[PDB]
Amino acid sequence: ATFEIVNRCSYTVWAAASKGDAALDAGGRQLNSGESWTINVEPGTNGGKIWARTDCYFDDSGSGICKTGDCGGLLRCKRFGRPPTTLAEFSLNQYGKDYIDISNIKGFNVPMNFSPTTRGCRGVRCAADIVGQCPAKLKAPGGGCNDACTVFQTSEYCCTTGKCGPTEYSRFFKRLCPDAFSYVLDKPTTVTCPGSSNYRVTFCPTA
């Protein structure tokens, strides 16, 4: 499946694409404002994610650091990134269907639209000013708004017992972005698309 990743933000982002134990395509690339990066993702890929990283410095070997979403210091990510990261998540060709969603369970750093470019399903967006409105205790110095599991490490925010409810913190994310997951047991906002759909992820869809 092809994903076109477009940076509509006024600032540079370093896109990342991983399935947690391997890079997807090249794994990451710098995108200046306006630039688009087309990747191919193998059919059947389960648990893929795409995210943006902000304020990164990389050396000639592709080693360095980013203030949000850093994936162990690498330009080309093999592993998932450090929160806070707005996530576009997908599992492809799962019993004839693709499944996509946007999640704030690892916090929020950049607004995003995740939409098919082929027919048969709708896209999802989280474009609110979550960092501007972020409760004081979740603000990340690096930039971004952390989720409460990352900050407080409790069984209730991390849903570690498989039973947990919404919280003051998850309801903040949900109020601003109803179509994104706000906690691990949120009512699912997953969209089902035809198997082998193609997609576009756009950072800063409104700006």
UniProtKB/Swiss-Prot annotation:
Keyword Nucleotide-binding included in the entry's annotation: no
GO terms under cellular component: cytoplasmic vesicle
Keyword Disulfide bond (UniProt): yes
Disulfide bonds: 9-204, 56-66, 71-77, 121-193, 126-177, 134-145, 149-158, 159-164
Compartment list: Cytoplasmic vesicle
CDD domains assigned: TLP-P
Keywords annotated in UniProt: Cytoplasmic vesicle, Disulfide bond, Signal, Taste-modifying protein
Chief location: cytoplasm
InterPro entries, per the entry: Osmotin/thaumatin-like_sf (IPR037176), Thaumatin (IPR001938), Thaumatin_CS (IPR017949)
Similarity comment: family membership: Belongs to the thaumatin family.
Role description: Taste-modifying protein; intensely sweet-tasting. It is 100000 times sweeter than sucrose on a molar basis.
Name recorded for this polypeptide: Thaumatin I
Organism encoding this protein: Thaumatococcus daniellii (Katemfe)
Phylogenetic placement of the source organism: Eukaryota, Viridiplantae, Streptophyta, Embryophyta, Tracheophyta
